[PDB]
Swiss-Prot record, chains I, J:
The Ig-like C2-type 1 domain mediates homodimerization and interaction with JAML. The PDZ-binding motif mediates interaction with MPDZ and MAGI1. Monomer. May form homodimer. Interacts with LNX, MAGI1, DLG4, PRKCABP, TJP1 and CTNNB1. Interacts with MPDZ; recruits MPDZ to intercellular contact sites. Interacts with JAML (homodimeric form). Secreted isoform 3, isoform 4 and isoform 5 can interact with the extracellular domain of the receptor. The chain holds residues 20 to 137 of 365 of the full protein. This is Coxsackievirus and adenovirus receptor. Glycans are attached at N80. Residues 1-108 form the Ig-like C2-type domain. It comes from Homo sapiens (Human). GO terms for biological process: actin cytoskeleton organization; AV node cell to bundle of His cell communication; AV node cell-bundle of His cell adhesion involved in cell communication; cardiac muscle cell development; cell-cell junction organization; defense response to virus; epithelial structure maintenance; gamma-delta T cell activation. It comes from the Eukaryota.
Amino acid sequence: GLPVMTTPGSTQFLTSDDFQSPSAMPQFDVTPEMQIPGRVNNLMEIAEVDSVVPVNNTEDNVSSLKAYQIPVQSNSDNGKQVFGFPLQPGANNVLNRTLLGEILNYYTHWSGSIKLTFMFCGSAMATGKFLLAYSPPGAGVPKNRKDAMLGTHVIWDVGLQSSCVLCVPWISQTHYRYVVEDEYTAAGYVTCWYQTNIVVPADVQSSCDILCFVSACNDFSVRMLKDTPFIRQDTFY
Amino acid sequence: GLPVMTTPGSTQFLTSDDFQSPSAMPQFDVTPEMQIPGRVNNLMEIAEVDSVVPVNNTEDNVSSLKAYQIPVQSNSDNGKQVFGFPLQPGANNVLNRTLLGEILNYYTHWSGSIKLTFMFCGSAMATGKFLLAYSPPGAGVPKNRKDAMLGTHVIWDVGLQSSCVLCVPWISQTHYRYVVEDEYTAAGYVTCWYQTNIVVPADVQSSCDILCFVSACNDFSVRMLKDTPFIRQDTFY
Amino acid sequence: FCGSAMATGKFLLAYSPPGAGVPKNRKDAMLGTHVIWDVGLQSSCVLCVPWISQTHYRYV
Amino acid sequence: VARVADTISSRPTNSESIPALTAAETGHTSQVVPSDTMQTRHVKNYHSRSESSIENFLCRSACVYYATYTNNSKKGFAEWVINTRQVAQLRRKLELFTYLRFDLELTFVITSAQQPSTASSVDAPVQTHQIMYVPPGGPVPTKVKDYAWQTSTNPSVFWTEGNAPPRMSIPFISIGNAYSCFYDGWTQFSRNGVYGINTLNNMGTLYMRHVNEAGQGPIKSTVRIYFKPKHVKAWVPRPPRLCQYEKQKNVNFSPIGVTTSRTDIIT
Amino acid sequence: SDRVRSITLGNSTITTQECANVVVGYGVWPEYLKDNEATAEDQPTQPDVATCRFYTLESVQWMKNSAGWWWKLPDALSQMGLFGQNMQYHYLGRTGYTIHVQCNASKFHQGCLLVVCVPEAEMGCSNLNNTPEFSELSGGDSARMFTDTQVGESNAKKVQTAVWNAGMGVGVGNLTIFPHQWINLRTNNSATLVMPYINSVPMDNMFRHNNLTLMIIPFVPLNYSEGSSPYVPITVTIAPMCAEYNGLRLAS
Amino acid sequence: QVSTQKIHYTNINYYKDAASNSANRQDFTQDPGKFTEPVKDIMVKTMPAL
Amino acid sequence: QVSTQKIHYTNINYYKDAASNSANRQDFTQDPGKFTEPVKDIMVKTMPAL
Amino acid sequence: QVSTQKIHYTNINYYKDAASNSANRQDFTQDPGKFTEPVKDIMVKTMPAL
Amino acid sequence: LSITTPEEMIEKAKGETAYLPCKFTLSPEDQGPLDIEWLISPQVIILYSGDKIYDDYYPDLKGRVHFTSNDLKSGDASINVTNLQLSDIGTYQCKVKKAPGVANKKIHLVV
Amino acid sequence: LSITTPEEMIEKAKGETAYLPCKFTLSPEDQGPLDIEWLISPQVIILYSGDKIYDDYYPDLKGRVHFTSNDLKSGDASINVTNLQLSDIGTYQCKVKKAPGVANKKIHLVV
């Protein structure tokens, strides 16, 4: 006849509690496990994997494979802008459906730096140079090559190799950032300008393309798990 | 006044729980046990015991003792089929009411190999040879002796001894198999062909019979206990 | 390959031991012994036919 | 502790070791850290990746299916085959992997609702529900007033209102070594019939019914079922489902663009 | 150097002067079945030279307006000699493949490919009620192809071959999480993957379960100026490794 | 039995099974070396990939 | 008192009887040698039965 | 675990977090030397402030 | 339960025999009694309840329909429609109900 | 939700264009569908529900009002009132309702 007292919080069903429970089938012997290859152990072994970014939406290149091709042609004037998009890896309509996006859309607070691998999938005799700049927020978007080379930037050269990994650093006042579209914690902008024109020999196409990947560095993290706003349902299947 | 909290799962009656309980009659002294012979300790001491298989149903040899006699007579042509039945030891209408069947019909997942003892209960001057084949699934049933001797088979000879134990091996992708009639986990077929004809001297009957037993090897096991689909009831007795 | 300097390609050098006829489709000859030659900086590939015969010698 | 790696200081170099340029053809993702393309300060990092693990991502209960059954009617009782394909907020979390292995923790939240009775002075006592679990192959009941309910050795639970919701635990019940959330290939050796159907993940049914009788006025109830995958291990990750589900059996869909669109490539 | 490789198996050899590194599955190398994991009750057979070699599938043309191609893996070698012959008489069997795809072009063309090997690729039908039949889901060492237009609805048993969804209802960009390599006609010439046995049971039948799928999706389409060769073919050559079977039976 | 938390905390197992214990929540181990770099020859960061 | 499960688990007896303890569930012992081979002379496998 | 009260008292932690423990109620420490005398040179009581 | 093709289009000529197949397999979780129906939407036309056939329901089709197989409990619900006419255009529903599963087949016949 | 100025006084001359601005920002806890209203108290005059405009509600003002921006989901609810007259004195309420937030703006127009 031990004396006990029932504290508030009894006879409730918390959705995310961890308690023991009586077994339904006792002495069930499960089948022994097998060393199946490819064992994930933390969802941050998926943010490390590159995935192409649909950065050419344009409302008609979306329902096709053209959304991933970035137009790069032999310009006449120097210092033109190739692309540009704000960096909100959970709210932007570009980094949303990438492999990083559907991992971020389950959490709310993230951190760490992001890499951006580019790959010149053009001809074999063509060269050129591009300026990948990342301007932290506070002002507007940069509008002239003279403006964007003030921020953080790499001057990419195309040669034997076919890539250059602009890693956006983690420059923010707070230890985290929201994944929803906010204004208090903006994360800047990403641009990419012609350093020098795209020159080609004769009998070679002047319309080349570029693909762009995205991933996380080795200091990424998330927090405050929630559910995704993408998948709806009205009745059962 | 210890503080406690009541977790979900209280004031419920789980049908298969194991808890202590207050005694109804305290200090009851039971009568001392007696070394009664024949103590079973695990229902896998019953699957080891042979039991004849009703493998001659034929819709009229069922309501008699003829269901267990396998017709074997002195044929004229060579290479005839004696019997044949699929091997689903919980769903087939042949291995169902054997002693293995009413042990399997309480569980759902089984494993291990099965032996099949045959016994030529014929005359004393008659000889012959039979080919007991077990064709794993994937194709249809074998239809010619040339086809069934491709699988696993023993070539039985009748002499002084009067038995031959075809042991079907355990050849299956999964660690278990369902006892209900399924298609994803079929277990093959069992056939038995004339190797050579059944010859007899004069003044001896040419119509002999054969009985067939069934049992489990020493690596049998079951799991996931349920109730049998055989016994019904509408009101109490 | 004594061709040009910008041209590439790949060839399948197959040696089918006897017993059947000559192979007549690429699907047939890649069943025997074969190398899949690629042309690049180097300009050669040495298919070595092995010694596969029942007798210790062969007539000329 | 699962701490993330800190960042080390750097100085402005001028050398032949270029960490930036690499070859993405090799299928080998980059491995650079910001300390290799700019000047960084030695920042101790205390962030932790604990709340992103597998057991912190999956071990959270989620409604699966819910049925209703009236009291004052013949065969008023609910059946349900056990499968996670039906609700989509949980289906998508289980498609991120191909071969899962977990034991379960069910939970039933049973409620009642008084129906439009017609007599006068209706008053009913507390109710008692039964939730019977039939393994795959057992005998199934046909009506409420049946003798497969009591005289049975299946696992069932008896629960009455006004108390905590019932809960039982189910171990890893399968024929293989992992549940398969995908299975490409037919189920008949002749390659006919249904396409993506597998015996590997079957778990039986669930029969529920009232225990009281019809006193004076019908009572429709409702039961909600909640999963909780514990001890989970995942294998062979998979991209997340994009197109909207349409059926519970297969993975049919209608094609839809990759992302929502913007007005111009530079905005 | 660091650009050349020389792969040999059985009695066949593959040599490439210009290529990138080789990607090896999920980090494991294909080997036989240990006896802690074995489930068959009998002893398996191991040809080991009669099957472990490079079979060459049929060729495909890379037109400018191409969409893609896919092969169902332990189904495409159904007719290639001793492998297909041992795949019939037995009942179980495990393998591990060494896929190699090769498409060469000059220095004046442009293009790119994504050579991915998606495991357990389940595809969706054109009609939401039905499921794709066998004839239009795979072909004996023949390449079924994607499309750039959404397949209509009045078709009864067909595959939805809209490429921007990879047929599986998943976004086509996120496919890189599986082992893959890029055929890039600028610097690359050949892509090669080494895929172990990935399945939830130690062995399985091979006529009912295509436990892999080799897809090829041209991201940057082929393009060239007038004068260069207008015909650029692709050829994939697959080679089993560490194969073994169980459970003899009749032909089927 | 007694272990640390996110000080200490005490846990006792009551039932006689394994699928009845509470969630683990504390298997902190990762190894992306099989998804990021699944190549045969080691790739050094500084030196070029070719 | 403390024993292993299908790690460890703790059990304590409260009442002062024997028919009040919980089920055993852990008497794993078998001996089919009295149902399979109930014969007087030992039967060896290889040599014939006669 | 066991500590004194306002005799002794026993406390045991059950859950595996840190925000689940009860209130502390026993952090008795003060230091007004940063609000009362926030000056650079020390000020002695007896001697005048100038 | 599962039907191989939940809906399709069939075309036959007037005066021929119309084959409207209905195949299925049985998952392990199905152990109840068998029930097979057949509908028409220009109304039951044939039943199979309790292993016995009841098939005098549609006066327009008397004897003009009957099951094909002799193993109706194995996955065969097909019907043999004979002597096709012009008043036989309409959608058919092969409704099979084995506890606790259910599956249908929408055969839209056009002539 | 939050409006920059919940109420102010505006003065324009008869025959000019009247600018009645309505700006807002979006807190993180707002994720529902968008709704924007406009009232008048001398009665809805224009709606924005489901990303589509419904604006034939006030017979006295037909075509004399229309939104300005082309990014109405970014924080612009302003209306372009043209050709001011004398019967247009009254308080306006810019009622925007995004789940689960709500914010108003009381524009008292005098002429």
